[PDB]
């Protein structure tokens with residue numbers, strides 16, 4: 671049907687215990703060592719707090735897990751253990767529980783994050799290349815470890831713009847890649863969902879994350895954030911098709927024998943593929959180069975199998991100034 675071009679056998683070549691997260695038994699330390707200081711965010715499965723470890727004064731972030739399947743908890747914990755030491759992946763310091771209620775929580779290194787909405791309107795050309803390269807290091811690492819993140823978006827990419835530190839966070843949707851496995855398409859954020867998800871194609875792979883990264887790159891170089899701003903999941907595909915083209919969508923569907931929900935017939939319209947140069951204007955032109963556009967064109971493609979891998983993207987000339995520095 672479809673297979674990843676890279677890392678397709680990673681998990682099968684490793685011990686079963688590497689990927690069989692349902693069999694993983696975490697060691698749960700004592701949350702009483704941590705003092706919560708301030709709320710940093712909430713999702714439907716967790717709430718996140720800045721905290722201090724009272725035994726050593728370390729500032730950390732505590733993610734308290736709430737209406738969370740025990741299976742989903744094991745999945746996230748095992749994935750984070752497997753990613754230990756990976757470049758630009760958030761460091762899991764410990765897995766802890768309230769010793770009375772037994773509610774589990776994850777303790778992460780602290781990052782002093784710069785608000786992305788303001789940041790993405792003031793990045794320089796070099797900054798964009800630099801941070802995209804840093805994020806690619808994280809994705810190549812997790813892909814090489816047999817793991818798809820499945821929720822790449824600005825809110826999950828912490829950037830300390832003072833120290834030039836980037837971390838990919840929130841591995842709660844991440845999954846192990848096994849060839850031919852059919853996955854749930856209800857992953858990622860609307861604006862960052864790949865076309866495969868929007869057309870209900872379940873045999874996807876690491877390349878989903880490369881679509882999401884391409885969406886981020888487009889928003890940075892063009893300053894339209896989010897770049898593809900759908901009103902719902904149906905409109906999200908329409909917004910993509912208005913740029914990539916409708917005939918081109920149909921060729922992708924045909925290649926993979928994908929059935930299209932007939933509600934799309936009355937909303938997709940007919941759209942030519944647009945040149946990426948159409949998005950250049952006086953305020954973003956200093957961020958756009960031929961290299962940037964060539965890279966973007968090779969990421970924001972319908973055909974997931976023909977998108978650049980994270981490594982291929984890192985090798986692209988767009989990043990040569992970063993490597994040289």
Ligand SMILES: Brc1nc2nc[nH]c2c(Br)c1Br
Pocket residue numbers: 710711718731733760778779780781782783828839840
């Ligand atoms: Br983990 C983690 N999650 C967060 N959510 C909002 N800010 C966050 C930070 Br900083 C970290 Br570290």
